[PDB]
């Protein structure tokens, strides 16, 4: 239970371990929030979201 194994590393989506550390990233159409963990849609109908 370390880094990306401990709750996806607190990342919203992709989690990678670089130099014994967690680095989050997002799918195309999202931008990593200022906290470096959350993924914010860049427009309407971002991928992977059920439409409302």
């Amino acid at each position: 239970r370390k880094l990306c194994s401990l709750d996806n590393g607190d990342c919203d989506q992709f989690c990678h371990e670089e130099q014994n550390s967690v680095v989050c990233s997002c799918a195309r159409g999202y931008t990593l929030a200022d906290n470096g963990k959350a993924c914010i849609p860049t427009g309407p109908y971002p991928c992977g979201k059920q439409t409302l």
Partner: protein, 234 residues
């Protein structure tokens, strides 16, 4: 889809439906972007000429969200083999862009390492389509979805009377009457992570449907992410 539930309004927006000259759905697909559809290479064999319909949930009415698209380019894996269904992946480039709206949105393409270690290690994935509701049953006029648990690689290799290559993985139930079926092929297999869905498989084949001691076999999308990428740029 055998068993499972109906996709409710806006629940399976990445679902695409390949239709033949007679406007009948014969295979599924997953919307990857405004221009690209992901499907099974073996589907490109079920019809002389076809088109892609999106936003459909009931092939018996005109909800108003449906849109038919012509295929400009068919990009099938150079190594696909009809004999073993290995490398069962194809990408379709549409002549005109898909306009996202209700019931029409793309599924996310994950990163391989994260997907195989975090997505595919999840309990279940979701499979959907307008495919048969029985092994001898007729197709569904309604789009359905089924939560299928990921199946242990070894257990599946043992269960199958046919080779399970490195480009496939299994999901479904051992005895429970729930599984994809004919007509669902090419369709999406997605995995949810924190309210966001990622494509993890392509409905490929199975021995019958929901048969006891047999699972649904899907194309391992994570093994074709670099291939999909160079394809969506050509």
């Amino acid at each position: 889809i055998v068993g499972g539930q109906e996709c409710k309004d806006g629940e399976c927006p990445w679902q695409a439906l390949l239709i033949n000259e007679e406007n009948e759905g014969f295979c599924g697909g997953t919307i990857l972007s405004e221009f690209y559809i992901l499907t099974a290479a073996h589907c490109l064999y079920q019809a002389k000429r076809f088109k892609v319909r999106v936003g459909d949930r009931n092939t018996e009415q005109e909800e108003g969200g449906e849109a038919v698209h012509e295929v400009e380019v068919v990009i099938k894996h150079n190594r696909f083999t009809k004999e073993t269904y290995d490398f069962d992946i194809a990408v379709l480039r549409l002549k005109t862009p898909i306009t996202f709206r209700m019931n029409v949105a793309p599924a996310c393409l994950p990163e391989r390492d994260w997907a195989e270690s975090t997505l595919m290690t999840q309990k279940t994935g979701i499979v959907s389509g307008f495919g048969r509701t029985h092994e001898k049953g007729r197709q569904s006029t309604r789009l359905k979805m089924l939560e299928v648990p990921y199946v242990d690689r070894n257990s599946c290799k043992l269960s199958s009377s046919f080779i399970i290559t490195q480009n496939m993985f299994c999901a479904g139930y051992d005895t429970k009457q729930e599984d994809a079926c004919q007509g669902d092929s090419g369709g999406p297999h997605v995995t949810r992570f924190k309210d966001t869905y990622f494509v993890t498989g392509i409905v490929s084949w199975g021995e019958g449907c929901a048969r006891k001691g047999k699972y649904g076999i899907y194309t391992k999308v994570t093994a074709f992410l670099k291939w999909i990428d160079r394809s969506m740029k050509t």
